[PDB]
Design a protein around this ligand. Sequence first.
Ligand SMILES: Nc1ncnc2c1ncn2[C@H]1C[C@H](O)[C@@H](COP(=O)(O)OP(=O)(O)OP(=O)(O)O)O1
Ligand SMILES: Nc1ncnc2c1ncn2[C@H]1C[C@H](O)[C@@H](COP(=O)(O)OP(=O)(O)OP(=O)(O)O)O1
Ligand SMILES: Nc1ncnc2c1ncn2[C@H]1C[C@H](O)[C@@H](COP(=O)(O)OP(=O)(O)OP(=O)(O)O)O1
Ligand SMILES: Nc1ncnc2c1ncn2[C@H]1C[C@H](O)[C@@H](COP(=O)(O)OP(=O)(O)OP(=O)(O)O)O1
Ligand SMILES: [Mg+2]
Ligand SMILES: [Mg+2]
Ligand SMILES: [Mg+2]
Ligand SMILES: [Mg+2]
Lengths: 481, 481, 481, 481
Amino acid sequence: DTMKVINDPIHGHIELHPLLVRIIDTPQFQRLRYIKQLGGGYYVFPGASHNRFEHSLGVGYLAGCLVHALGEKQPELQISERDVLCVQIAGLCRNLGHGPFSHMFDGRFIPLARPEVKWTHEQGSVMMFEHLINSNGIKPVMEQYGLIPEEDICFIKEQIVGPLELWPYKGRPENKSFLYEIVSNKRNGIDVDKWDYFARDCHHLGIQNNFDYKRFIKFARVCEVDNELRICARDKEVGNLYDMFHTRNSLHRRAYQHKVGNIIDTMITDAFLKADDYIEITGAGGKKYRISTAIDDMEAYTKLTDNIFLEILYSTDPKLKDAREILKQIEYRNLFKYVGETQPTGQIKIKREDYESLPKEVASAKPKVLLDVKLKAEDFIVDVINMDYGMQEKNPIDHVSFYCKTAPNRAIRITKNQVSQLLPEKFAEQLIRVYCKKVDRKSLYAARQYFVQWCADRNFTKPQDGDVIAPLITPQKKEWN
Amino acid sequence: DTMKVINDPIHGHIELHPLLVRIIDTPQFQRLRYIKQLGGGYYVFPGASHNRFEHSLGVGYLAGCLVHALGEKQPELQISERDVLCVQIAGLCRNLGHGPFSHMFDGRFIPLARPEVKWTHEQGSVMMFEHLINSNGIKPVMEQYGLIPEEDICFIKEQIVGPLELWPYKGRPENKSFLYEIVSNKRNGIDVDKWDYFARDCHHLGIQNNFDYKRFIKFARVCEVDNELRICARDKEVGNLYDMFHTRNSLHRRAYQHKVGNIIDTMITDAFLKADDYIEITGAGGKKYRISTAIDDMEAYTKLTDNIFLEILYSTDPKLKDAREILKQIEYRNLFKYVGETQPTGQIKIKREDYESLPKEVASAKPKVLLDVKLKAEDFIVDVINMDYGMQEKNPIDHVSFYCKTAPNRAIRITKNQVSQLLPEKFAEQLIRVYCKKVDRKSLYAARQYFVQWCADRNFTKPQDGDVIAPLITPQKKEWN
Amino acid sequence: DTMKVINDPIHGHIELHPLLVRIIDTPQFQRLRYIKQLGGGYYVFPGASHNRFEHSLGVGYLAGCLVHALGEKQPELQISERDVLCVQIAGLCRNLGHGPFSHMFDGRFIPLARPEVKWTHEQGSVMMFEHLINSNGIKPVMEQYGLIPEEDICFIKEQIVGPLELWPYKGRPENKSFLYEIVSNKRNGIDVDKWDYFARDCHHLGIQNNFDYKRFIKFARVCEVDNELRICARDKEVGNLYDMFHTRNSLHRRAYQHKVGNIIDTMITDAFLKADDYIEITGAGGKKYRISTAIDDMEAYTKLTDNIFLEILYSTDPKLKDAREILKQIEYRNLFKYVGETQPTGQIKIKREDYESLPKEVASAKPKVLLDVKLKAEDFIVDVINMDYGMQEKNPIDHVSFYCKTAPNRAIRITKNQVSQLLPEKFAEQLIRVYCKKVDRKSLYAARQYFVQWCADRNFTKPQDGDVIAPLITPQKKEWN
Amino acid sequence: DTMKVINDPIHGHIELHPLLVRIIDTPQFQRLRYIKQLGGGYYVFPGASHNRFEHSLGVGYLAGCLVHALGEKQPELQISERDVLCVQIAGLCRNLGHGPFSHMFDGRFIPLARPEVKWTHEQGSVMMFEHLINSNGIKPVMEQYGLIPEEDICFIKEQIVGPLELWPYKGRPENKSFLYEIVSNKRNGIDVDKWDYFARDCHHLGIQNNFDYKRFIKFARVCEVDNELRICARDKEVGNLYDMFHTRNSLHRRAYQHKVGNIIDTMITDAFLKADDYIEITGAGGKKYRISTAIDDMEAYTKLTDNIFLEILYSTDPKLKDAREILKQIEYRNLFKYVGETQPTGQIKIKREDYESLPKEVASAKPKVLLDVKLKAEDFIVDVINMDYGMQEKNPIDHVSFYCKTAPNRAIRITKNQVSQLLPEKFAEQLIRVYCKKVDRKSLYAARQYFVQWCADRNFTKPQDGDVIAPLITPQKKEWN
Ligand SMILES: Nc1ncnc2c1ncn2[C@H]1C[C@H](O)[C@@H](COP(=O)(O)OP(=O)(O)OP(=O)(O)O)O1
Ligand SMILES: Nc1ncnc2c1ncn2[C@H]1C[C@H](O)[C@@H](COP(=O)(O)OP(=O)(O)OP(=O)(O)O)O1
Ligand SMILES: Nc1ncnc2c1ncn2[C@H]1C[C@H](O)[C@@H](COP(=O)(O)OP(=O)(O)OP(=O)(O)O)O1
Ligand SMILES: Nc1ncnc2c1ncn2[C@H]1C[C@H](O)[C@@H](COP(=O)(O)OP(=O)(O)OP(=O)(O)O)O1
Ligand SMILES: [Mg+2]
Ligand SMILES: [Mg+2]
Ligand SMILES: [Mg+2]
Ligand SMILES: [Mg+2]
């Protein structure tokens, strides 16, 4: 077995080590060819056809790039080829746990079908990785290339999900702590996964990317920080880092949280909910599973991809009809109609226990305008979106270590006031989108009245089209003026 | 209703007329989201995830661009909004008839599964267009926006497939002959479909395009040629046109006819053949169909996409195991192994009646070298590829009309010697690829001996790696070295 | 005379009207081929070789694009071909007044060599436009193409510089008010000039921006506001607009205000000043002019370009050597050394009256570290840069008119709290860079001590490398520690 | 001191070794900022503003990339950091010898001003390199970083011009022969200089590049052929190589030999000739030199750039008026008029001794058209352009060594017949362009009659617009029809 070269539109010609090749050429990895990166985003951005497979390749590639650069500019770190391979494998495999339409599955479907469980694509990734290793006899191949499976498999899993349960990792000691900052950076969110999806998503969406990850890699070092060895960025690049998160936020505003893309995610999820009792995926031994239970058997999960959509679509079985028509309403583009967007004011925050109580509030909303058709709770959809810099209310740049030209291994910290005052004052907010599931002209009018009224009463922000869509309501007392 | 804007990575923001939108928002059109543009090419070029849907949008857009530009520079052509709409619709819909993995279906599967019948993706497109119109009540929508359904549907179909069988067209008179040169150009192959897949395939493959379609549009005029009004290119642009076809040829050499991509198309095709008796697709009124017979009922064809692959992959049914097994060997990357490439010499040409006659020919030849293994007809695959400039042995530029700066309304002709002596001397050739279905080291050695000997016996060209893979055979051949 | 087609790397093939062609082919316009867009920026970003010529072509092109799009979507605006031509000419010619190395000249040189006069590149553009027209007989050509010279020339000049003297314009009436918002938008700064230099500068710098001007153009309308017809943007596009200005700020941080690029602009300016008594430039009747006084005669200004640099570089006369030597220290890369950066912390701002008093203060700070050299003001350079959103402390988006999907003809306003809470709270700030003109190790050490001490004494922000370059000074103030 | 990072739009962030930096920061190298890569090309393609400086940086970068890659895939070659540095330096410096407007200077001006001499930009590069070394005291710097000035300077010069005169090189032994194939490949022309100008010129022209140099680097090896060590390409990449030269030819057709670009080069050259008596350039020790004699003293040549153009343009000395007005006729776009293009037929070729007799041949021709204006020899320009694949009549791919995957280290040859039948049959041809120095309508008409008649008389190819520009002449010739 020899090295393979693969041509990627984003990174160009990528070299894949034979071990990476044997990991890639498995049913568990090839599965990612049938899972769309941005899910329902494709039904809004027609270029967004790319899948988790190529993304995974890109993440592995960039992980290798960064670890290799660090290794070559600072030999005293003793980064081994074994380290490089493990970091590449973690990069390659940290998307293994995604389900149909990616985030829709873990962010929308599973929380509704099985509110029981705490499931994330990360855990799915460790489980699926274990399953890949075991089902494909990769351990002797790992050994063949100088890896020690019991130490290194642990290292990889820890890279993907963090500590498997004050140095909490058992795959690598603290003098190699920086190796844990590459694939999934739990301390500030700056990792190679973001870099690849910036470049790739922008390539396919038709939006252009302004973050230069190659530059970051060029300016990256390893420093001592509180007796740990961590990745330090050159000081003057701090601005770029802010821009990075700005970029992330922008991509969420323009594409990932697109109103119609989101309502399509919602409709698809709902169809999955109405199909969850009649669609079956056969797992280990021959035992049978459903969409919501596929996550409990990795052999079953292996056969759970975007294909389920088409299965629901092409079915003839009557028991699936409630599902099958929903998808068809997507095909005819008869979608739930968008009513508007608003935000909480002051210190008010929307808790996740109170979401189901939100359409019903809107349905209750006070009249004021002459009434026609009247809509109920089930006719309204309320979607709450949390926009942040990846670390709740916190500024992630406060958790970045920097170095100076004068003393390149002396780590320093940089506060927001040392960079710019045009920077954000907050790093978290919520957006509330309201849609109406009945689509005729005056049901839409009514829904608009209900919505604007509801915004006024909870003292939310004034809807941008407020003066137009509800001229009789927005005049009501005037701190919307 | 009103205009829609769509963001395409290739063309930017595209405006879609409400009628185009109503055509697009049908299951017949949306079907194309599930058919890969380059089919098995995706399994070699990981960026090639794009589907026929986005390509179709692009072709429709470019058709609109060209017809509009011609109309705007030459008002005396009297191009109507109606004409523009018909050309856009034809552009949008000329890909409707493609089947699973695109060219794999009409180029490989159907010819083996249904050798009696005459099937093309063009005819499929016409049929599917008819079915779309009728199933979705598009005629009244057409009338609503100023179209005359009985002439215009004819016009559109003729744009897609040509004269339905003097002036052979019934959709438009001869003074608008140029309108038939835009979407599918039967006269020289220069059309907007090519331009779009040049740009899009290059965007996704990671290979770059050197053809400037925008420049061509800028320099395009309509002039009179043989009592018709046809599209003429500015004289000095003739070089670009040659480059265009060179580009096409190049794209086939690098990507579309990639050895491994083709072998994967072949394996998928074989799997489809071995699954064709057990896979059922529900058509009109409930009648059931097979993969090879789905093309006879458009309601069934509507649900025949790339999905069929995954069905075969995910099945449990024992009657499908021989099919399913082939697919799984694709997942494990256990592919038929490439033995070599060669070409006929002189005037010898291989017709499709002789294709089935080729493995038996390769196995019968025997080289003066001691072997080990002996191979049969079934162990060989022989793939014949016709590389040309789109008009077989002809020079397509001999079928292009040009105009000069001094007299922009006078069409002229340009010969190859008036352009360059560095141009191709022939415009068609055939490539012969040979693969072996046994993958062990020694079946492979044997297969290489059989292959090089066979090349010698038919006086084909010397395989490029000839001296290395068969050192005992290549000197005994003096029409080489 | 016919349309000319020109190939630009940014916009592709652009069509130039014969009148535009006649304006371009004059020494006054062709002059711009010899003035670099980013000046000394080229000495930091080696790709930034582009000149004001190609930029001007781009601005003219985009001006035409916007006016034409508006005219075609809203025929009721009565936009004439004459209007389109005047807007194109204004776009083409608003950069005519730039001097050697662009913004270095009017922003740094003229304020120092001739502090008496109020000079801008805008006024220079009006003057040079007049000179182009009169010196090249363009008025009869204008009439030849349906323009009315004395109203339209007025219109063009007003587009470039604003009102020449309530409706303040005499070139066009209020029902054509929107035409004044295209080439140079004095009301919120959103114009096609920005759009071209974003794309072009990014193309050459090798840094990239995410602003889509084509999308904006697609969503642009004309609405009635107070008493005029002004350009309206679609409501939901407001986010993009914020991003636009963010982009601009980013572009200033990364490239236009690069510490070294700025110090090189400073050195070139000083050389020009020390040369400002011996270089002589031929004027109107033979009268002779010099670099600072060339702006008083357009015939002389026509011959004032970047060339002056090389002339000073290649000269032999001793009265020029203090100049010629400065330039050579640029060639040997013996530049003034960068000492550090800081900012004010309250609401009082370093006024432009206090700049000359800033180096002396740096000399005034007493650092209690033992030094070996001590420096006075001449060895320090203090550069103060105003970073804003183009409208002082104000939010330019507060000056943008929007429209809604439901009522495209009703202009509305959108406030910051209505978009996001992650936006900037102020829209203006200042950067303070300090350099040292003596470059040996000990003057640099000393200068850093002086600088950090000066930061301490004035309660400015902590230099990012503060603890590293001056560890003995920095503990003195508990809020850095 | 230390490494610098520089951001290039083509290659991204490039690392510069301190020695390279000290070579770059000299007047001899910085000189290249003022010499346009494509000369008069900028006056046709407005994006083509880039200079020889950034191109040189790109060539050094790619030279480094290739030598590094070879060193890392095959350690047994014993490539040292010293080798890498010497190759990078040669890459950086092989453009030092270009004069004003690049190829205009050595291709047009010098051959006319001094037909005597054997001058090339290569020899200029060696002389200027010597002058840089000596004038800037870089030898102790070379020694400081482990280079041996006598052998290494020899090596670099040999890389630029070839053997300074068995094994003809004395800079490096035969086991390092492959190192001579990187910067200037005298054996087949495949070198990094080409790769960089493909990418950069395409970036700036608005033409897109279709050669993948990174791919080539990935598939490049060193093999033994004729007891020498040469760079080998992977066999299956041979098609790409043909495409490479095709690309080159294409770039010459579209941009480098553009009719108007070439005529502008011609006019600038004539201006240089008529100025050749009055501009004075001070050389070594106050000795003074001419534009045509600057090449004999490197101190003078150092101060000979594109600036010369502007000097002539801005001059007031009456003795320069003949030059000065010519340049002005460029500014007003009053150019020599393009009459037409033709080529020799059969195997007859035009020698350079016969170039001077060709306008007289055109003026002597008698066309049977009624004329009143008739033109003489001095009114015609005949430009003969040699288009080839870089090796005169030879196929350069016949001089490329290949390897097969089965024996990656055994060199082989591949003939044209083993690749395609669609390839060029000849690899050299000539283009003959005719221009007229009188630009009026009737002189242009006359010039066209003379030209087509001259083509008929020499049995050249029929001009593409022949039937249009000279309808009374072209029927006379029945090898035209
Ligand atoms: N001419 C080409 N230009 C650009 N990319 C190419 C070209 N040919 C193939 N590719 C792409 C497709 C793949 O993603 C990647 C590898 O291609 P390729 O070299 O053909 O691998 P291969 O496995 O088929 O050949 P082999 O096993 O004989 O080395 O490069
Ligand atoms: N901010 C953006 N930048 C670039 N592209 C965008 C942006 N927002 C959306 N797109 C893309 C996605 C779609 O393919 C296309 C349409 O966008 P969009 O304006 O959101 O249509 P829409 O139908 O959702 O809005 P609406 O119906 O209210 O007019 O443009
Ligand atoms: N083959 C090409 N591809 C892309 N751009 C080109 C090509 N040839 C020329 N260009 C560019 C250069 C110019 O900027 C622009 C116009 O060139 P061109 O069409 O040749 O004008 P022209 O004035 O010399 O020809 P003519 O006067 O005969 O119409 O396009
Ligand atoms: N934020 C940026 N993004 C992209 N490119 C940049 C950015 N800043 C600078 N560049 C470019 C300009 C230069 O060509 C190259 C080097 O920039 P830079 O790192 O600022 O050099 P420098 O010499 O000024 O820094 P240093 O302080 O280390 O000496 O990168
Ligand atoms: Mg391979
Ligand atoms: Mg919409
Ligand atoms: Mg022309
Ligand atoms: Mg530096």
